[PDB]
Design a protein that fits this description.
heterododecamer; A: alpha+beta; flat; B: mainly alpha; binds copper (II) ion; Insulin A chain (chains B, D, G, H, K, L)
Chain lengths: 30, 21, 30, 21, 30, 30, 21, 21, 30, 30, 21, 21
């Protein structure tokens, strides 16, 4: 594919598209 | 990590996969 | 007011927004 | 599931917090 | 909850999620 | 070409885009 | 409503301007 | 105001509520 | 209408709204 | 895991993300 | 169409590449 | 071009139309 610049809700939308119903974790550094 | 990088630098769909359930 | 169905991408958009920097799990198989 | 407190049937903004880290 | 950084269409999506069918106004300074 | 249904969040996304800095009202009870 | 010029049935881009401030 | 702030600084879901119909 | 500031996926969403089912091309400089 | 329906705006969001800087055509009449 | 490899019925992430420039 | 401009500067809905199928 192609590399993406993914911030905020667009990263979350990327994990949905890539993981879908397998599902995912969203874990920002703290 | 992923969150940081993908927004500071670029990540591939393949890197995002490391995060799936 | 009655809140809404949230499906697929709209639902992880809602999680992001609500959890933000804490982050979240989306596990649909559950 | 979350697909079941939330997309199937309908949940509060409070319910979605159930799933925050 | 958590504080959010919300610009452009993402703020509009935030008001939809928070107000829903009660509804809302979107009023940028001019 | 025939334009489309716009529902929930897609519809306020369309308002934003179309009104921009003028802003808008979304009042669904209407 | 707007849900009725626009989601129920279908409107022009022009119709959505009806709702601009 | 809200528009300005939430994008320049951070706002809580609770602040956004001040804007509902 | 009003002029818009449109980057990334929001430009793509703008072309969808403006072109719809006529359809469109998305062609970044290279 | 079984991937999903993508409709209207969700489908061009998926194209963007997948093609990125190469860009894409969305031609629905096809 | 793409509406037919993808919204009508269901496609792979690979299929959507079919449509990249 | 369009991509560049609309994100660096502002473009009208009318400019985006130049890009439709
Ligand atoms: Cu954005
Ligand atoms: Cu949708």
């Amino acid at each position: 594919f192609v590399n993406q610049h993914l911030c905020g809700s667009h990263l979350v939308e990327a994990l949905y598209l890539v993981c879908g119903e397998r599902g995912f974790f969203y874990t920002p550094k703290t | 990590g992923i969150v940081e990088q993908c927004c500071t630098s670029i990540c591939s769909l393949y890197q995002l996969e490391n995060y799936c359930n």
